[PDB]
Amino acid sequence: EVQLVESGGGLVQPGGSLRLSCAASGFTIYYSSMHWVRQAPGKGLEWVASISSYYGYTYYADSVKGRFTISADTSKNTAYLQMNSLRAEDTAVYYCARYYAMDYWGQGTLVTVSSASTKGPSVFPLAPTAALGCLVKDYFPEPVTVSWNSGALTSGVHTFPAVLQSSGLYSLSSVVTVPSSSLGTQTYICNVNHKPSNTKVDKKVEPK
């Protein structure tokens, strides 16, 4: 299977630098053009930078030129995007992809350029067909991910988009509906991972 695995996102101060990497497996990167494409939250796709096959000539959107540098390491089969002088306007999910009609994409990594500090979530039970959930409150930056029972419970989960609170901190809920017959036998645990602060929270949600 052809795969692109990106790494190197996260929170950066205005003016700082980040290096994105796009590790490619299942093909030789030398033979393929690589491209970086970004998505501001809730917005369209915007092309950032391209690197050609073989020769490796570079092209850049006018709004990142002289600040970003795309490159590729063949002996690592990885492409990169060095980003200098990041500004709030550079906040986005960044994708790497191959070819001009981009057939394979990275999973995407979010770049947040801000001077607010990182803060892990507080997780609260939403205790109980029965509904139950986990309130994932007061975290920064995005993202967080929520699973249930270590991913063994997927049917009927609704993890909601975060809302930005007036504090500047994000909050969200993730809820699941289950048979009420299981409220006494089956235990339900939400698994909340906030990689920007290197924090995972596991919370058993019990009926009250």
Partner 1 sequence: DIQMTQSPSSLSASVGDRVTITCRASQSVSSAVAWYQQKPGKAPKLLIYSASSLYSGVPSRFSGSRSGTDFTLTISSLQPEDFATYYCQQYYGYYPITFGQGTKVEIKRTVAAPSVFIFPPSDEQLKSGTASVVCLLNNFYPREAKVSWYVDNALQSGNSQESVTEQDSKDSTYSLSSTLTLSKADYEKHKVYACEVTQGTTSVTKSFNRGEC
Q: Which parts of this chain interact with partner 1 (CB under 8 A)?
A: 28, 30, 35, 37, 44-47, 50, 54, 59, 61-62, 74-75, 95, 100-103, 105-108, 122, 124-127, 129, 131, 133, 135, 137, 158-163, 165, 171-173, 175, 177, 208
Tell me: does residue 31 bind its own copies (CB under 8 A). Answer: yes
What's the rounded Cα separation, in Å, for the pair 51 and 72?
8
Which candidate, 95, 104, 158, 91, places its Cα nearest to that of 131?
A: 158
Q: Rounded to the nearest whole angstrom, what is the least distance from the CB of residue 50 to its own copies in the complex?
A: 13
CA separation for the pair 53, 157 (Å, rounded)? 43
Q: Which does 185 bind (CB under 5 to 8 A by kind): its own copies, partner 1, Na ion, none?
A: none
Binding site for Na ion (CB under 5 A): 72, 89, 143-145, 147, 160, 163, 171-172, 191, 193
Q: How far is CA 31 from CA 2, 18, 75, 104, in A?
A: 14, 26, 13, 14
**172 in the Ramachandran plot: left (φ > 0), alpha (ψ -120 to 50) or beta?**
beta
Minimum distance from residue 86 beta carbon to partner 1 (Å): 21
| Residue 165 CB neighbour total at 10 angstroms | 12
Output the six-digit token pair for 17. Answer: 């630098």
x-or-dash string of contact with its own copies, 143-172, rule CB under 8 A: ------------------------------
Candidates 4, 6, 21, 32: give the one binding its own copies (CB under 8 A): 32
Give the DSSP letter string of 145-164: EEEEGGGTB-TTEEEPPPEE
Binding mask 45-84 for its own copies (x = CB under 8 A): ---------x------------------------------
Q: Which is nearer to Na ion, 113 or 144 (CB)?
A: 144
